[PDB]
Ligand binder design. Sequence first.
Ligand SMILES: C[C@]12CC[C@@H]3c4ccc(O)cc4CC[C@H]3[C@@H]1CC[C@@H]2O
Ligand SMILES: C[C@]12CC[C@@H]3c4ccc(O)cc4CC[C@H]3[C@@H]1CC[C@@H]2O
Lengths: 248, 248
Amino acid sequence: NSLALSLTADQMVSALLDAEPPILYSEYDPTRPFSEASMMGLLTNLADRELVHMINWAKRVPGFVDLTLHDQVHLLESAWLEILMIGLVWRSMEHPGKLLFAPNLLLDRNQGKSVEGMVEIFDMLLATSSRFRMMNLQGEEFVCLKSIILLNSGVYTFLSSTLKSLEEKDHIHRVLDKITDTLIHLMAKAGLTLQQQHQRLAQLLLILSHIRHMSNKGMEHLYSMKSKNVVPLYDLLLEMLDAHRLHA
Amino acid sequence: NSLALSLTADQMVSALLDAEPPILYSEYDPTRPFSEASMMGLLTNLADRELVHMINWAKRVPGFVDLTLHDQVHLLESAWLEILMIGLVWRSMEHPGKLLFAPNLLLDRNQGKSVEGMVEIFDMLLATSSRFRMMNLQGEEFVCLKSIILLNSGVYTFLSSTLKSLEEKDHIHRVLDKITDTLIHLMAKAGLTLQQQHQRLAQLLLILSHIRHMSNKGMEHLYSMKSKNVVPLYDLLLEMLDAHRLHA
Ligand SMILES: C[C@]12CC[C@@H]3c4ccc(O)cc4CC[C@H]3[C@@H]1CC[C@@H]2O
Ligand SMILES: C[C@]12CC[C@@H]3c4ccc(O)cc4CC[C@H]3[C@@H]1CC[C@@H]2O
């Protein structure tokens, strides 16, 4: 019984849409040459800035703040990259063959070749973008999916069985069911038949497994550069996630 | 129009069930000590033997042989490990805390600690097994899911856009929709309401994203041992997949 399981389909949608994060710009001098900037440095700087905003977004996803601090952290540490990728793919949907990492930063596959291992990832992201185009993915659907990833990605890795942990997983699976009801709701409204509904649902959810795959590939690349000497992501997340209530 | 898109739910189920592969045994001398055998050597030998049988299984999955040789190969090269894992998890469903890799080879997490990186994977597989138990996963559902993985895992990585390739992807997405219809069918029969249906469907499909994750982790481990000097999996698959029609 909470301000999460009570909501109706349209309430969840509105909640998710209003919670959407902003679209950041790549930080580079626009009046200066380009073959000067570090593509990676740019992508990394952008991701880091977006993370800060991803936290605000998560806290506004119905049911998320009802969880424990550490559970909230685990889920984000597990899904952060997939969340960034789906957003990226969503933005690029209307730019065939390009990835709109930022309004002032559109890259085609050729531009991903200046870095080892990056070209493969760019092609998977582009292919995902085309898939969405093909499916005519809607913004209402996009938000549900992105919220689904936040909750589902790290739910199978809680290396705990305490009573509290069982109550936590139950809650998560309950919220996910509500998001499922919403997606179906959004489809019935649209005019899709019942068959087309369960079919579109499957099609969308199965894309999530490819997004997971892209994150793993991305984690591999990321983890090959940085070294075991940097505040482990867990902590940064914890610091930003464990906020006080002073700036009332 | 083919012996695939024509079938009815019960026909697909029967097809999938009758096509099930056999349960192989680990090859080791049962009358000899155990701390003697190579855990990895055993797991690798088993997987290799199962692959041979996975090919026969795939060829019997409705719609699979209508695809081109190379497409059939790509899909298997992409999903083989996930297929082995789901099967493994399915077998272990009635053995809390253990992984029944084979009837004569049951291992708990302690036994996975004799090898670097393996303990993490054992825990993800065990957690998946528990999840299925919890969901009371049915054998009819299991086969649909395993078939879904075969078709969905590598469909987003066909680095081709020829007309033939578009016709190939269309076919795959059409078969997948049929498997979706089957799953729903299997649930309505069971007595689940329409809400519980789309909800159970979501729950099952979302598990597939975790199975993908386990494969990536497994591929990382596998790829860290063997060396770039072994008949690349593509070829073994091609050889076994490109069969003649002489043993009529
Ligand atoms: C993490 C990487 C840099 C940042 C990239 C990014 C940065 C911002 C964003 O919104 C999405 C993505 C998706 C792919 C990410 C890349 C995968 C490999 C690279 O290390
Ligand atoms: C591929 C590995 C050996 C074979 C293992 C196996 C072997 C047979 C099988 O039916 C399932 C699995 C799942 C995990 C696999 C392992 C993941 C890491 C290891 O290299």
